[PDB]
């Protein structure tokens, strides 16, 4: 007569449930099921909804994750090509479309993935127009003006992965170097998450403690040893890791659920993602690049003015002029 | 000009966040500061309301929890004598009100705890009218009813801790006599919280194998294994633990955050709290005992059917007629 | 006078760390990383070492963990195709090896596998005299008995993952049939972790209550509830998701994170895995199949007696004598 | 015949354990039991030793801590006067002995708790010759001097939780003033926990923006709004959270937590805590107090250089001789 009804008695009538919050990642790639499992091994997700166009695919990531529920605390995983199965969720992850062949610009991946853009962003908003944006798909800058265009939601809302990742390989690389902990050592690379990303040497610290002003040559052609590479080795890792794997994403996935996190606790914690710069340190047009800004439940709601050397601003310049001359001759 | 100006620049212009997963603890004694910490522990609450009458004392917890925000991910913490610093919380926890002397029963208490009620309750739901209330204050279950009737909740927004600890307690002291984790065994004290709680027996396993079908003679007086001296240890714990330290706080602070994590994650975990009974096994008044119950988003949205042995099913009507007999002469 | 040196004073000279938490895992695919993140997600391991045939992969792996190092708890991760990198590990899980086509059975894959683990199994031990080992690749079964015989190492050291998988997927099932958490489901699927798994019908039960009791039919196939139908869901699991995305490993890599737990937290949690049943219902073999078992520091130190029916025992004496007619024409 | 006996078969012989990191705190009161509670809600320990002279409170701490065991990961939970319960400690946390009364410096303990540690520092060091030892009875700095000399345990292992809670308290304060979360406000207060604390205020920093750079009057006396109330803030906290409570707790039970966690997870963090500055910034003695430190599993492995201001190096001067003045006359 039903397990159900015979062995559950209801105290509250059947009804609406409603998630409080809901995540959904577009793309179940490499990248996708990274920042899936990220999102669901630390509980950010009451309802996690998958969506491709790898129907097939899609729904066998969908089952093997529903198998560990047992280990996790997510109490609905859905998924579907259909967008219906996106609607009210707070934050839409998408990481669909090309990523980089061995050895290929991030840049020249722009025109086959605007024109996936084009398609999914209406139909994401659609079913969610009061959700936070995540954009991961590279190039991911240009990409998040692109999102911003399409989609019409406000500025707060539309937020580029960005350097995230780069800084915290950064860190990672400085923290080797030093032997302690990345979350001990404090370092911004901005601009694009690319190759003309942005080293600001000027803010590289420990316990305070400036390393520009322990080596004041740090970050130029006469460096003992020897933090441009550093910074090489941050524009390259990318490329070396495609070369060896295929692909990166546990970085990635892992960065990602770090964005989540802030914004779902409300935290107001600062971290270098894609925004909108026009009107900062000289910028004239509407460029998205990495600055630091304070993420929480509204989106990115803040951006930090810093004190950038005149090296650094014209590097942020630069990296910006490679973005303008791509976004400029977008067409609609 | 302020330094917050200089440094930081509004994207979205404007903070105001939306009222979300805000909790708040109501008594900021033993037991409520000792549910504080385990919500905050496991980071379930984006904004912590405490109320007191005892201003002081009130002030002094909410700053030194406040100066542990760096390790924390609540980013608001509050407090007032008033409950205007309440509003809008999903969820509230009532441990306010006099306590158990050392050998003094749990109903000595109602008459100077039913004033405390009339006075918070109504205050509550007037700041908070979609709020979730957990009551722990003794004696629990006549309180929770009290809570009920007060506050014009539907059933499923009004919990008591109940029989929670009492499992907790049982589950615990079964672990100790097998040598395995408390959450590898399985048995359930349900009915009323303190003296009259009532051992499922044929419910306590290990993997699924029935003890009692091992030991048929367990819950007798003549029983190799003593199951009835372990139920008569759950029984006295109250006591023992006041006696020693004076009060009990630690295992029903971690039992009340086990309760709302189930909930703000919308899990449907299975709980032993206390529902309104009426109408179950035989009860004909309106009373609050605890049974095997599923908490989500939504509250207490449903109890376990069991098939109760005929000595089970009298105790829970020998509570239900106990309780009814305090709760028939309560006025207002 | 490196940047270290002019930054960093030594205060009790010298860096040099104790082998302790270390676990390696061995094999890179699709349940190794999946092990592997689910591992590094909950700050299992201090330090952990990656170990494969493909050198390229091995490296791009690690690389990409590494990046990930800001947002995680293990100050060390490395990767070598030589075993040198393992040494000291307290545990090791090996999933390297060849898997299923959609389609084929695991056992298909004994000989193939059996010569990866001739060689491998040797390699551990002697890095690792001291480990705990817990076998994935399949066949499971097989597979762990060929690495307690090539180890050298006491039964409690070698685990099987073998039915933990399947008994998950069950809790997921039923969960799914009643509307509540898996956790707050109970039901134990044991012997051997493929198609002919057991489920141990009077161990399920929600809250206490015997599901088979209310439904005596449970089971068989002329039941109401089709509980038959949700088994032989479990069983048909492996093959519909590889027919979907072409293998599996979110469930699996959750699964060992889990047990690991139990170990490095020395819970005594019970868990279904394999371990070896000689002289247990009746098998005269040396064998391994999943029963309930306690594990901790030590790993895997005792089992769960359990009152099996006659066809339960059957199907178990029935894998055992399969298991052991390919065990005993493996040779060296 | 025996529960276990019956039901659970071993797998390994009956054996021996030992606490892989088994915790012990010394003192239960207000600052032990919240040390406690934080550790175990942070799965820190596989076992938990308490200590203390007063035997009743003792136990009903520990009981009431056991029955929330079902909501814990740590196995084991002993509590005796006798330091034997105590060996194989990895981590010894002391908060034993008096503390202050209204309005009473810190520096006013010193006589009747260097009485208390002469008594207990060797029962301590005699069960755990090994451990690492974490001071927290006030006077802090000069208790974990006293410690260092008592124990003849390397500098590495004895370490005062000195000025990460102040710290915690300058991040939270600041936060407050920007309106982010503390973890993205980085800012030391070095020296003595007490009224001669110092705050580096060249290091402070958002985002690693100079606040100096950008309000070079920070710190001074013509200081626009208006840092120097900031530090005071700091140093008044204790005695206003005492006036209001009584004592204060919750703080630096998450403090210990934090510092305890960067030890046994090995990671190198960097901490503000107590160790021995003698031949820094020119302080000519034996002097402990707090600046920043690395921690990982073997204690405290390194101290920060800083680049000081003058003033900066002024303060801690002052700090230094305000100690060591007491220290000077302490009798063996
Ligand atoms: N921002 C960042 O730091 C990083 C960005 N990426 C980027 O992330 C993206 C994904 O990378 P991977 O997951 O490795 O690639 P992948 O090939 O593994 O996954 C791409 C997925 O997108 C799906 N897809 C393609 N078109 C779609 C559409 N029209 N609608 C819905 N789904 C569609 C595909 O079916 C496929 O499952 C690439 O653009 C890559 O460059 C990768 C690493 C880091
Ligand atoms: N349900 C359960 O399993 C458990 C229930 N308890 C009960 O929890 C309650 C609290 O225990 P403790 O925290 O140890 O007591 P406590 O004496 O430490 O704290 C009681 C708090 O209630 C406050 N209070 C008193 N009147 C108030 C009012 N009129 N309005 C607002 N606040 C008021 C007091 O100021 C104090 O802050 C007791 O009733 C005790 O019996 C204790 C353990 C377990
Ligand atoms: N026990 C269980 O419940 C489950 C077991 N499995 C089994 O796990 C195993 C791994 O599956 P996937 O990761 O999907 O396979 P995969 O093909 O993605 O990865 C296999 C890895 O083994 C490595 N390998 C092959 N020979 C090796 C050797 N000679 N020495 C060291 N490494 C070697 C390969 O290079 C590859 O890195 C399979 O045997 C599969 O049947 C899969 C799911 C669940
Ligand atoms: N370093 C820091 O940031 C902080 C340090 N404290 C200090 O921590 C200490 C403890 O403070 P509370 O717990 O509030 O005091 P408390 O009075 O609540 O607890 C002190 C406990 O120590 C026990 N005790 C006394 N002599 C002992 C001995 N000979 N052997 C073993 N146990 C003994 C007492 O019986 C009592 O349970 C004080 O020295 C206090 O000033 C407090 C807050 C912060």
Not at 72 to 77: A, F, G
Not at 119 to 130: A, N
Not at 301 to 326: F, G, P, R
Request: with cysteine.
């Amino acid at each position: 007569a039903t397990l159900k009804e015979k062995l559950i008695a209801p105290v509250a009538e059947e009804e609406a449930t409603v998630p409080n919050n809901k995540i959904t990642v577009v793309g179940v790639g490499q990248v996708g099921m990274a920042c899936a499992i990220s999102i669901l091994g630390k509980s950010l997700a009451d309802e996690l909804a998958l969506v491709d166009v790898l129907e097939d695919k899609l729904k066998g990531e969908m089952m093997d994750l529903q198998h560990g529920s047992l280990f996790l605390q997510t109490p609905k995983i859905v998924a579907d090509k259909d967008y219906s199965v996106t609607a009210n969720s707070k934050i839409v992850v998408v990481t669909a479309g090309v990523r980089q062949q061995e050895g290929e610009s991030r840049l020249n991946l722009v025109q086959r993935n605007v024109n996936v853009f084009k398609f999914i962003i209406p139909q994401i908003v659609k079913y969610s127009p009061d959700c936070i944006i995540i954009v991961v798909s590279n190039p991911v800058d240009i990409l998040t003006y692109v999102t911003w265009k399409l989609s019409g939601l406000p500025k707060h809302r539309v937020i580029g992965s960005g350097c995230n990742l780069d800084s915290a390989r950064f860190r990672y690389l400085m923290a080797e170097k030093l032997g302690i902990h990345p979350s001990s050592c404090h370092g911004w690379i901005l601009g694009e998450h690319g190759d003309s990303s942005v080293a600001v040497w000027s803010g590289v610290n420990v316990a305070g403690v400036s390393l520009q002003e322990l080596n004041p040559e740090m970050g130029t052609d006469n460096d003992s040893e020897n933090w441009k590479e550093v910074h090489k080795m941050v524009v390259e890792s990318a490329y070396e890791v495609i070369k060896l794997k295929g692909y990166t994403n546990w970085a990635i996935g892992l960065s990602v659920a770090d964005l989540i996190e802030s914004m779902l606790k409300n935290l107001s914690r600062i971290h270098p993602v894609s925004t909108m710069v026009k009107g900062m340190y000289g910028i004239e047009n509407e460029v998205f690049l990495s600055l630091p800004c304070i993420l929480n439940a509204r989106g990115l709601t803040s951006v930090i003015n810093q004190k950038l050397k005149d090296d650094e601003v014209a590097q942020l310049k630069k990296s910006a002029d490679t973005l303008w001359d791509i976004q400029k001759d977008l067409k609609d």
